[PDB]
Enzyme design. Structure first.
Site, short mmCIF file in Angstrom:
data_model
loop_
_atom_site.label_atom_id
_atom_site.label_comp_id
_atom_site.label_asym_id
_atom_site.label_seq_id
_atom_site.Cartn_x
_atom_site.Cartn_y
_atom_site.Cartn_z
N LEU A 10 -43.23 29.67 72.91
CA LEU A 10 -43.47 29.33 71.87
C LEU A 10 -44.76 28.44 71.91
O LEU A 10 -46.17 28.36 71.78
CB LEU A 10 -43.11 29.07 70.52
CG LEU A 10 -42.63 30.12 69.79
CD1 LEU A 10 -42.71 31.79 70.23
CD2 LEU A 10 -41.73 29.70 68.40
N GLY A 11 -43.81 27.63 72.71
CA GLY A 11 -45.84 26.67 73.19
C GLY A 11 -44.69 25.83 74.27
O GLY A 11 -43.53 25.60 74.78
N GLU A 12 -45.30 25.38 75.31
CA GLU A 12 -45.27 24.96 76.51
C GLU A 12 -45.50 23.46 76.66
O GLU A 12 -46.74 23.29 77.23
CB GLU A 12 -45.03 25.76 77.79
CG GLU A 12 -44.72 24.78 79.52
CD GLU A 12 -44.52 25.57 80.14
OE1 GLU A 12 -44.57 26.93 79.82
OE2 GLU A 12 -44.44 25.80 81.01
N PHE A 15 -43.59 17.51 78.73
CA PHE A 15 -42.01 16.92 79.12
C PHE A 15 -41.06 17.72 78.05
O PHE A 15 -39.83 17.22 78.16
CB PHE A 15 -41.99 15.75 78.55
CG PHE A 15 -42.57 14.29 79.34
CD1 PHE A 15 -42.01 14.57 81.10
CD2 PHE A 15 -44.03 14.12 79.92
CE1 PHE A 15 -43.16 13.89 81.63
CE2 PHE A 15 -44.22 12.98 80.55
CZ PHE A 15 -44.25 13.04 81.37
N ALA A 16 -41.49 18.40 76.51
CA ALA A 16 -41.31 19.29 76.81
C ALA A 16 -41.74 20.67 76.49
O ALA A 16 -43.00 21.39 76.86
CB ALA A 16 -40.64 18.57 74.99
N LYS A 17 -40.90 22.13 75.70
CA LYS A 17 -40.45 23.02 75.26
C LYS A 17 -40.08 23.83 74.40
O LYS A 17 -38.74 23.46 74.41
CB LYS A 17 -41.04 24.50 76.68
CG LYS A 17 -39.68 24.75 77.39
CD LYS A 17 -40.43 25.36 78.98
CE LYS A 17 -41.53 26.16 78.75
NZ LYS A 17 -41.39 27.07 80.31
N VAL A 18 -40.53 24.94 74.12
CA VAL A 18 -40.33 25.57 73.41
C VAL A 18 -39.97 27.28 73.32
O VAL A 18 -41.84 27.41 73.42
CB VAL A 18 -41.12 25.22 71.79
CG1 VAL A 18 -40.09 25.66 70.10
CG2 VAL A 18 -41.24 23.86 71.52
N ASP A 127 -42.75 10.84 59.05
CA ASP A 127 -43.87 11.15 59.61
C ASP A 127 -43.46 13.22 59.11
O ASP A 127 -44.28 13.49 59.44
CB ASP A 127 -43.84 12.21 61.20
CG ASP A 127 -45.10 12.67 61.89
OD1 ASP A 127 -45.54 11.73 61.41
OD2 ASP A 127 -44.93 13.81 62.74
N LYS A 129 -45.35 15.88 57.02
CA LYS A 129 -46.18 16.54 56.29
C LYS A 129 -46.57 18.13 56.12
O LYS A 129 -44.98 18.22 55.90
CB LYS A 129 -47.16 16.49 57.83
CG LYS A 129 -47.01 15.29 58.91
CD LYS A 129 -48.35 14.70 58.36
CE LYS A 129 -48.87 13.35 59.10
NZ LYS A 129 -48.47 11.31 59.75
N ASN A 132 -44.39 20.24 57.43
CA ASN A 132 -42.72 20.32 58.12
C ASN A 132 -42.38 21.15 57.04
O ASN A 132 -40.85 21.44 56.44
CB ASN A 132 -42.61 18.45 57.47
CG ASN A 132 -42.51 18.32 58.99
OD1 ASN A 132 -43.37 17.09 58.61
ND2 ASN A 132 -41.92 18.81 60.05
N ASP A 145 -38.32 18.98 61.37
CA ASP A 145 -37.60 17.80 61.76
C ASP A 145 -37.40 16.55 61.46
O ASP A 145 -38.01 15.71 61.49
CB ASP A 145 -39.98 17.69 61.91
CG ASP A 145 -39.88 18.21 63.86
OD1 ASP A 145 -39.07 18.58 63.90
OD2 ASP A 145 -41.15 18.02 63.85
C1 LIG Z 1 -45.38 27.24 61.80
C2 LIG Z 1 -45.22 28.49 62.02
C3 LIG Z 1 -44.96 29.36 60.66
C4 LIG Z 1 -45.38 31.11 60.62
C5 LIG Z 1 -46.86 31.66 60.02
O1 LIG Z 1 -47.84 31.23 60.26
N1 LIG Z 1 -46.44 32.10 58.66
C6 LIG Z 1 -47.65 32.26 57.69
C7 LIG Z 1 -47.65 33.34 58.16
C8 LIG Z 1 -49.34 33.64 57.27
N2 LIG Z 1 -50.64 33.54 58.72
C9 LIG Z 1 -50.24 31.92 58.95
C10 LIG Z 1 -50.79 34.45 59.90
C11 LIG Z 1 -51.94 33.27 57.61
C12 LIG Z 1 -52.47 32.48 56.78
C13 LIG Z 1 -53.21 31.88 57.35
S1 LIG Z 1 -53.38 29.41 57.18
O2 LIG Z 1 -54.30 29.48 57.67
O3 LIG Z 1 -54.54 29.82 56.09
O4 LIG Z 1 -51.79 29.84 57.21
C14 LIG Z 1 -42.93 28.39 61.71
C15 LIG Z 1 -41.83 28.95 61.46
C16 LIG Z 1 -41.08 28.62 62.11
C17 LIG Z 1 -41.73 27.44 63.19
C18 LIG Z 1 -40.50 27.14 63.54
C19 LIG Z 1 -39.09 26.82 63.11
O5 LIG Z 1 -39.04 25.98 61.75
C20 LIG Z 1 -37.95 26.08 64.70
C21 LIG Z 1 -38.76 24.63 64.77
C22 LIG Z 1 -37.96 23.89 63.28
C23 LIG Z 1 -38.90 21.99 63.95
O6 LIG Z 1 -38.46 21.36 63.37
C24 LIG Z 1 -40.11 22.13 64.46
C25 LIG Z 1 -40.21 23.35 66.09
C26 LIG Z 1 -40.03 24.90 65.55
C27 LIG Z 1 -40.42 25.47 66.60
C28 LIG Z 1 -40.81 25.16 64.05
C29 LIG Z 1 -42.57 25.12 64.57
C30 LIG Z 1 -43.52 25.98 63.33
O7 LIG Z 1 -43.33 25.08 62.32
C31 LIG Z 1 -42.87 27.91 62.87
C32 LIG Z 1 -43.08 28.34 64.01
#
Ligand SMILES: C[C@H](CCC(=O)NCCC[N+](C)(C)CCCS(=O)(=O)[O-])[C@H]1CC[C@H]2[C@@H]3[C@H](O)C[C@@H]4C[C@H](O)CC[C@]4(C)[C@H]3C[C@H](O)[C@]12C
Ligand SMILES: C[C@H](CCC(=O)NCCC[N+](C)(C)CCCS(=O)(=O)[O-])[C@H]1CC[C@H]2[C@@H]3[C@H](O)C[C@@H]4C[C@H](O)CC[C@]4(C)[C@H]3C[C@H](O)[C@]12C
Ligand SMILES: C[C@H](CCC(=O)NCCC[N+](C)(C)CCCS(=O)(=O)[O-])[C@H]1CC[C@H]2[C@@H]3[C@H](O)C[C@@H]4C[C@H](O)CC[C@]4(C)[C@H]3C[C@H](O)[C@]12C
Lengths: 286, 294
Positions: A10-12, A15-18, A127, A129, A132, A145
């Site tokens: 997902l990300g690199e 000092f950390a990567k996912v 933090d 936001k 989260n 988080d």
């Molecule tokens: C950012 C994404 C959400 C996926 C998404 O995008 N789903 C909506 C789709 C709709 N779209 C955006 C395509 C269109 C909308 C347009 S708009 O731009 O308005 O959004 C969310 C879903 C699951 C989440 C991770 C997991 O929890 C595990 C882990 C928990 C840690 O604590 C923090 C790190 C990590 C890797 C999290 C990171 C991030 O938080 C993730 C990838």
């Protein structure tokens, strides 16, 4: 690694990567974070870090993102985290504008209960936001988080995108201005701004002039729109008190007139059971 | 055809409210002649007019109304009642460009360079007609069905943040991560250099998958930005790294110019400049005058 079959990166970061992964024994979407071990151990806060991570490992709240497993090697730490598929709560705003009062109050109830519970186990986010606030497929709030946010900033840069519309709004004036601060009061300010945005559809502090922007935040000068009820506005002004010494407490929010409407506190349990190998949380074990 | 139980301004019939701010609203609308769906932004006229920058606002909105660029969100028409201004804007349905990154991580070098090319051409084009964005952020980088970049808020970004707020969390963010240090420092005279810095940060995100300057601590965030303290991941080619360091130069005086970026070897790869026909009609001063429509 262990129970988990790896997916794409997902990300690199440096000092950390996912990495994406699935649990081969139950079919669960997870993510796995891998961080430089000595970057954490070297840090001054390590004793607090170990304590918060240990605690979050045990915590099961219906509105908190699960931290399934913490594992270490000789040079790395591995966190296994619940992956949800409902997206971000604020997606609802970007696509249909402000939420109705009753729907906003519901998500707020879930947020206040989750945050309060982590606090009662001695874990503070600090933090908080919009990014989260995640949703599961059933539209239940999942806050991410907790615990991880305690990690040093250089392993918090894990190659993922972290961007927030109107960042300074979510940071309490004392957190902006002071080295040390109360964790519970800082989280509550964030929660208060989150509620404002949910109910208004926009940030409470806007100003193109940065000096004027931060002056407003430090006096908590903002205006509730006319569609806020009297009781909702009263609560938000006590929460967005710029002095953390007089800012309302979580207990008082939970006892508040407006907050109690339709409030059925979540019934759940946890032990799991508590913390007797804490200082060995990041100890190598195959 | 027309709907008697709906209001109507010009050839457009107004539908429901998508978003509401204090002074601005966004509504769905429909061209009753040809059936086009559009978004219309409606703003308190008096609030727009009572502003010492109203002259700049009229010029930029007059220019934007005439520009047709494949990578810019189109503003078809501007109309006014006695108390409202209506901005008629095109829709997109391909979401936000940072969705790809947020759910699926970075992009490959070729596709990020592509998106960068579209951004740079659209922004350079607007600049050369005297319109500066000054608020470039992810909420303004949209995509259409072809997955082509469409930049929003050109022209509209000249309105005060609090006036153009429409309750949709798009137009008004005020996020320092994309802002040039001289702008943060209230010395962002050169609108083109300030837009270029935001373009540089946006590129970095596409190619890295993350922001070049980021920190939970606001003091530390601003310090990183002023010093342009960042590092490129190791999968950046040498030239890309070299271009990104030239852009993310905290001194705008020595920061690379738009023209130099356009003639940059890394930028030129696969680069096809947009072929399209290009006027000035008619009365900048009357852009917000009562149109005389229901
Ligand atoms: C950012 C994404 C959400 C996926 C998404 O995008 N789903 C909506 C789709 C709709 N779209 C955006 C395509 C269109 C909308 C347009 S708009 O731009 O308005 O959004 C969310 C879903 C699951 C989440 C991770 C997991 O929890 C595990 C882990 C928990 C840690 O604590 C923090 C790190 C990590 C890797 C999290 C990171 C991030 O938080 C993730 C990838
Ligand atoms: C309110 C804070 C106070 C400074 C500070 O830093 N206060 C102590 C905090 C300690 N920390 C949180 C860093 C922890 C250290 C832990 S450590 O691990 O480092 O030991 C300071 C720090 C940076 C300041 C802004 C920038 O100037 C940019 C800008 C300049 C323009 O003119 C307009 C004003 C503006 C918006 C400024 C507003 C305000 O004035 C800020 C937020
Ligand atoms: C954010 C919302 C739409 C929400 C949405 O549509 N969310 C994406 C979901 C669907 N997806 C793309 C994820 C599916 C992809 C499937 S795929 O498999 O391909 O990934 C969009 C729809 C219409 C948009 C406005 C208009 O422009 C008019 C106007 C132009 C100006 O300049 C100023 C900005 C403004 C107000 C715009 C703001 C914003 O931009 C709006 C509200």
């Amino acid at each position: 690694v262990g129970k988990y079959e790896l997916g794409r990166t997902l990300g690199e970061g440096t000092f950390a990567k996912v990495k994406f992964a699935r649990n081969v024994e139950n079919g669960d979407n997870v993510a796995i974070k891998v961080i430089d071990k000595e970057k954490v151990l070297k840090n001054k806060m390590i004793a607090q870090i170990k304590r918060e991570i240990s605690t979050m490992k045990l915590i099961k709240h219906p509105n908190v993102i699960r931290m399934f497993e913490v594992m270490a090697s000789k040079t790395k730490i591995y966190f296994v985290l619940e992956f949800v598929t409902g997206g971000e709560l604020f997606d609802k705003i970007s696509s249909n504008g402000r939420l109705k009062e009753d729907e906003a109050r519901k998500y707020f109830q879930q947020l206040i209960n989750a945050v309060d519970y982590c606090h009662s186990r001695g874990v503070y986010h600090r933090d908080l936001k919009p990014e989260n606030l995640l949703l599961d497929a059933n539209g239940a709030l999942k806050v991410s988080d907790f615990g991880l946010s305690a990690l040093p900033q250089q392993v918090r840069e894990d190659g993922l995108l972290h961007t927030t519309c109107g960042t300074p709004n979510y940071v309490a004036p004392e957190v902006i201005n002071n080295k040390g601060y109360d964790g519970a009061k800082a989280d509550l300010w964030s929660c208060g701004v989150i509620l404002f945005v949910l109910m208004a559809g926009y940030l409470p502090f806007e100003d193109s002039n940065l000096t004027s922007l931060y002056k407003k935040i430090f006096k908590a000068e903002f205006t509730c729109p006319p569609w806020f009820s009297a009781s909702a506005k009263k609560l938000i002004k006590r929460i967005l008190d710029p002095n953390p010494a007089t800012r309302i407490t979580f207990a008082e929010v939970i006892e508040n007139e407006w907050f109690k409407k339709g409030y059925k506190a979540p019934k759940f349990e946890n032990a799991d059971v508590s913390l007797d190998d804490v200082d060995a949380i990041f100890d190598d074990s195959g």
